[PDB]
Structure 1
Amino acid sequence: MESLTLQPIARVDGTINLPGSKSVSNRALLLAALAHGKTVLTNLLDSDDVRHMLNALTALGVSYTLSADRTRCEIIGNGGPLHAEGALELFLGNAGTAMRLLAAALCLGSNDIVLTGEPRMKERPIGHLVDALRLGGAKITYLEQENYPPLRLQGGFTGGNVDVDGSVSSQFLTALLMTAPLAPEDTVIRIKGDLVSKPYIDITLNLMKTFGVEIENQHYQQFVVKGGQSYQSPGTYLVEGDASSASYFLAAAAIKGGTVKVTGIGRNSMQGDIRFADVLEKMGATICWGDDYISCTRGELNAIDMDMNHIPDAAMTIATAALFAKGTTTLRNIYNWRVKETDRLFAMATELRKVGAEVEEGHDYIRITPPEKLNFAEIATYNDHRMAMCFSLVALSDTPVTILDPKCTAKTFPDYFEQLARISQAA
């Protein structure tokens, strides 16, 4: 078991040029692959989740080149749906975005492809998406547990009236929206009830529009899509910096700054996680917004009680920042933390208690009462990049913290610890 020990950080201050957005990167790569023409993506994220998407595109026959730092990618669009036969297996690691997006996209036309990944991926739900794709005509087989990958995709999605459950993951609707335009018939996607992680749907629609496709959004309850469309290369496209990756650094300043500025995202960003900055402000930190930066300056830190359904990933950062806040923090309406890289409610509660907090692990919320002082702990990370990054904040105190399997941050942020060290100051 590899581990890293972080020594106490007296103050943070500085500027971080953010790695590219994983959410934008994987959507842009799939759209570039489906589109006609050459797309040049810049500020693309180099991380495990993007590498799995790139490997899948390679396996599907898509041609592309990468710059030395793997952040510039020139993709030769396929000019239509991607294809492979012979039950070609695409291994997708624990990249949910790739799994869900490709599960839908590869249902176009005929195909015989198997999607699989690491053990945990075979425990992350996908039944709501499969149900919707089947209503549209797709032939999909669960090779192991019903409602979970691995899947054998044999094509057939033609369009039509498709219902989709949006209560567990927005990624199912995202995958359907990206796929439907290329189906031969028009598609009407009806959301069954609640829709969680709504801001990610806006990211999807933004990317689709960039690639030449718009649809009719009826108050997020129903989406009308015209079939027979084609995605078109936007030419050069700049991938936004990752707002979820930014959360750790902005929170670090709210706890121990100093002023930390993150570049690559700003007031105009399409990512919902820039709203994480609003939470820090509500807790007492000062935030500054620019066209291409967001910065946070230490003020004070008071506990909050908020519905965090709109920023599920960045919300984890508030759970550890809560250790430094005055009062009890409650994060609500985050049930799907349980079905992600790990069950994040169980993991977050377990590890927070190790450093001294009193924690109520609610079924779909978490209540955190910080200790008077933190104690040392060896933090388990559950093969989850965000557990490692969230707990790195424990070092903004008088106690060191040991993080197990620090390389798990490579899922979305390989250089996380060096970047945190860049803004860590001794004086």
Structure 2
Amino acid sequence: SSRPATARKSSGLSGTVRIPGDKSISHRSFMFGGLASGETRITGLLEGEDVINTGKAMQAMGARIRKEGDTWIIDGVGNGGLLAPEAPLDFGNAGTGCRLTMGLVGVYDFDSTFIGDASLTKRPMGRVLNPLREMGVQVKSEDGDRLPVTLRGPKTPTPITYRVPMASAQVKSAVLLAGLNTPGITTVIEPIMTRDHTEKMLQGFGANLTVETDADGVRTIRLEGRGKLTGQVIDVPGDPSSTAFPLVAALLVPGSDVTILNVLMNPTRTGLILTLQEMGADIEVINPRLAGGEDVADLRVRSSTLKGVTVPEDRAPSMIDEYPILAVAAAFAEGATVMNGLEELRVKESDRLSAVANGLKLNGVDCDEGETSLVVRGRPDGKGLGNASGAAVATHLDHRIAMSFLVMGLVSENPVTVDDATMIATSFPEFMDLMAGLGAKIELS
């Protein structure tokens, strides 16, 4: 059921590796390719479990998906062409696929049921189900608006103007996707910018979607519904969230020099790099270029001495999935690192604020967990950190809790053990091999 793993202090990590594909863009490649008219060809797709589940949900609604050589080829159904699924759409651990698909298919005049694993089933769906109710979708959900959920769209959906209450790219995305099958103009107002893969990719697929940004930063995103979408050639860039693991490991493990190739550098995804640089990290951005319509670069990372910094609440959306690994980096930095505006961490695969704080404490780190913040004081030499008794960090079915603590064990005086490595494959099945190839000592027990 669970498969624990232990990370041990390592000698300098060294090498050059291509990081797996971006999870957010990969989910959307399967969704948009499956919906569009004609053929979509995708290279660099992330083949982690989350993405595969989204692909299976699209196949259940009529898309034909296959892998030829290293390219995934999709024959889409055309906008408005999704077919009623025979059985529930099983998203496993994937909130991105689940929430975006609820918007995509909830507005269709047939029933669709959504289910998932023990982790996804505890997470909030109200943030997307509320706007969908406004568009005319009938919702049946478990108390607290949790899965399983069954949606039934109206014959004619109602377009809406929706101001997203929290900094969620998924809510913005679900409303836009619902708008694709809704007559009229659907508008999403985003007060604080979140990753913009939906907007960029839908424009690439031919959607009449515009983004207007006020000087104060508020984004008004307009989409004309029931328009044609045309299949595209997609080149998926490397995942900057997956990149964070070998990158932080190379900063922390003495004697390290690691280069990660083809990393997505869209600024809505690089808050951690900015933060680590402020902490004194040696991260070189090499050959910045345009690939697949996105900014990418190679990153050369060398061992660095880090100092604690203040990470403001407004930077959170650009690095929300990187707080676990940032907290591990802070555990080896000089002084205190303070991070606020972390409420969203409590509703991820695990309540990440709680899981990170507990994991850090179990491994001897001085930290203070607030309702929406975390303060970490580091021990640069790693002495006294880790857990000599071999006690395991509770991962709570969260791939990043498992990976962040395995990175910690490559630096701490005592080994770090995580209770389960099974969920790492949801976003980074290549993790163990990749890290081992760089010299990391991690053993699956």
| TM-score over 0.5 for the pair | yes
The counterpart of 2:344, out of the listed 333, 336, 350, is 336
* TM score, norm. by length of structure 2: 0.88
Report what 2:439 is aligned to: 424
Report what 2:292 is aligned to: none
Report what 1:224 is aligned to: 222
- Alignment partners' CA distance in 2, 1:281 and 1:124: 33
SS of residue matched to 1:24: helix
The counterpart of 2:263, out of the listed 255, 262, 265, is 265
- Alignment partners' CA distance in 2, 1:86 and 1:285: 49
Q: CA deviation at 1:82?
A: 4.8
Q: Kindly tell me: are residues 286 and 186 of structure 1, through their superposed partners in 2, closer, same or farther at Cα, counting changes over 3 Å?
A: same
Report what 1:296 is aligned to: 301
Corresponding letter in the other structure for 2:419 = L
C-alpha distance after superposition, 1:68-115 (max 9, x if no partner): 6xx521000111235344773111112011111110000233111101
Q: Does 1:313 align with 2:321?
A: yes
Q: CA deviation at 1:67?
A: 4.1
Q: CA deviation at 1:154?
A: 1.1
Q: CA deviation at 1:179?
A: 3.1
* 1:204-223 mapped onto 2 (5 Å cutoff): 204-219=198-213, 220-223=218-221
Q: CA deviation at 1:358?
A: 1.6
* 1:27-426 mapped onto 2 (5 Å cutoff): 27-67=28-68, 72-85=71-84, 88-142=87-141, 144-156=142-154, 158-167=157-166, 169-190=168-189, 194-195=191-192, 198-200=193-195, 202-219=196-213, 220-234=218-232, 236-256=233-253, 257-265=255-263, 269-270=265-266, 272-290=268-286, 291=288, 292-307=297-312, 308-309=315-316, 310-371=318-379, 372-376=383-387, 377-394=391-408, 395-424=410-439
- Alignment partners' CA distance in 2, 1:179 and 1:288: 40
- Alignment partners' CA distance in 2, 1:139 and 1:119: 25
Q: CA deviation at 1:189?
A: 3.0
8 Å contact kept, 1:12–1:259: yes
- Alignment partners' CA distance in 1, 2:319 and 2:128: 22
8 Å contact kept, 1:139–1:153: yes
Q: Kindly tell me: are residues 320 and 140 of structure 1, through their superposed partners in 2, closer, same or farther at Cα, counting changes over 3 Å?
A: same
8 Å contact kept, 1:81–1:106: no
Q: Kindly tell me: are residues 222 and 421 of structure 1, through their superposed partners in 2, closer, same or farther at Cα, counting changes over 3 Å?
A: same
Q: CA deviation at 1:221?
A: 4.6
Report what 2:7 is aligned to: 6
C-alpha distance after superposition, 1:165-223 (max 9, x if no partner): 331633111121233133222223345xx54xx331x2221111221124233434533
C-alpha distance after superposition, 1:13-65 (max 9, x if no partner): 21121111110000111011110110110110011101111111122121111
- Alignment partners' CA distance in 1, 2:167 and 2:203: 25
Tell me the percent identity. 27
- Alignment partners' CA distance in 2, 1:373 and 1:214: 57
- Alignment partners' CA distance in 2, 1:422 and 1:174: 37
- Alignment partners' CA distance in 2, 1:85 and 1:339: 30
- Alignment partners' CA distance in 1, 2:85 and 2:415: 52
8 Å contact kept, 1:180–1:187: yes
* TM score, norm. by length of structure 1: 0.91
Corresponding letter in the other structure for 1:306 = V
Corresponding letter in the other structure for 2:344 = N
- Alignment partners' CA distance in 2, 1:18 and 1:79: 32
Number of equivalenced pairs: 415
Bigger CA drift: 253-262 or 403-412?
A: 253-262
Corresponding letter in the other structure for 2:39 = K
8 Å contact kept, 2:405–2:417: no
Gaps of 5+ in 2: 289-296
Gaps of 5+ in 1: none
Corresponding letter in the other structure for 1:203 = H
- Alignment partners' CA distance in 2, 1:312 and 1:129: 19
C-alpha distance after superposition, 1:262-300 (max 9, x if no partner): 11225xx33633332222211111221123312222232
